[PDB]
């Protein structure tokens, strides 16, 4: 025994399954309209992003 003690600290994880309550009419949502604009043009594919 050398002349010093020590404290030892860890961290440990848990896969927890959760329950979310959320009351009525808490949030107001606004939804726009989608639009299609292409952004990669190749010899094989012409991609898009909506």
């Amino acid at each position: 025994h050398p002349g010093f003690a020590m404290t030892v600290v860890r961290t440990d994880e848990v896969l927890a399954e959760h329950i979310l309550y959320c009351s009525r009419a808490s949030t107001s949502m606004f939804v726009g309209l989608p639009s299609v604009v292409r952004r990669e043009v190749r010899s094989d594919a012409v991609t898009f992003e909506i």
Partner: protein, 294 residues
């Protein structure tokens, strides 16, 4: 025709001080992690590698990266523009310290090696510090480095033995840079260049053995005729090396080590994330160009 607009959202609004520092650098080439358009703040700048810096790990990163230019800074977010090969853009000269670009030059994109006030902008609204690269013309971009590579070597000899280096002779020929008829006094207080000076000096002793060992093996009737001419440029003392004092398994590992510091030191100065300016206005600072990788 095609979309190039990388909208960088922010989880929180910018400060009133932090917004106006980014308003200045509204034309600025930035490295950027991926090419798609919805990204976070952690993807832009050299802060992924530089936020204790190293030289070659940033210089090799600037070739493999996707470069982009600022266009708009709103409070809650940013907006960029992706820079394609052979793609005309419009860059503003904004980089501190100021170097006075010129038209019909070849601007190269270098890593920053000056202080943390000129290089980066410290944001504390989000916990990230974006880092701007060093966009300097190519001929000045190497004279700004081959003189500070001289300063970083002689400041290590005078640390080990101070009687060999003259400080007054040192900062009279290194801190001044003459290009385009103008003198730029640089700012030096260098842990950036501690990768080159250990690669360029570890190559400094393998070359006098390496050019005699490669000439004694390549002697024959079918010798290329120009090597007869450069058989005299090699000095007197280099042609007195006994190659028998090292073993045959040691002379293999002083070539394979040597050839890797020949190429990997040659590659980072022949890197090509450069861009050709064809118009520049000295008082508006706005410059048109086209990008050209490698």
């Amino acid at each position: 025709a095609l979309d190039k607009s990388i909208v960088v959202n922010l989880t929180s609004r910018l400060f009133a001080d932090e917004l106006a520092a980014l308003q200045s650098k509204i034309g600025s080439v930035l490295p950027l992690g991926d090419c798609h358009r919805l990204q976070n703040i952690q993807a832009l700048g050299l802060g992924c590698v530089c936020s204790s810096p190293d030289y070659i790990q940033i210089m090799q990163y600037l070739s493999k990266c996707t470069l982009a230019v600022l266009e708009e800074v709103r409070p809650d977010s940013l907006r960029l523009t992706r820079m394609d090969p052979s793609d005309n853009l419009q860059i503003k000269n904004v980089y501190a310290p100021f170097f006075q670009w010129d038209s019909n030059t070849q601007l190269a994109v270098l890593p920053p090696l000056f202080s943390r006030k000129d290089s980066t902008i410290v944001l504390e609204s989000n916990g990230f510090d974006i880092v701007f690269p060093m966009v300097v013309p190519q001929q000045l971009g190497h004279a700004i480095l081959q003189q500070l590579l001289v300063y970083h070597i002689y400041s290590k000899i005078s640390a080990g033995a101070p009687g060999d280096v003259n400080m007054a002779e040192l900062d009279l020929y290194t801190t001044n840079v003459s290009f385009m008829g103008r003198t730029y006094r640089l700012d030096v207080d260098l842990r950036v260049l501690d990768d080159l000076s250990m690669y360029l000096c570890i190559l400094s002793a393998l070359v006098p053995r390496g050019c005699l060992r490669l000439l004694t093996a390549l002697v024959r009737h079918d010798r290329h005729p120009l090597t007869e001419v450069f058989e005299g440029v090699v000095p007197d003392e280099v042609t007195r090396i006994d190659l028998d004092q090292l073993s045959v398994p040691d002379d293999i590992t002083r070539m394979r080590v040597m050839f890797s510091y020949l190429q990997s030191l040659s590659s980072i100065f022949n890197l090509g994330p450069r861009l050709h300016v064809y118009a520049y206005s000295a008082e508006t600072l706005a410059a048109s160009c086209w990008y050209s990788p490698r």
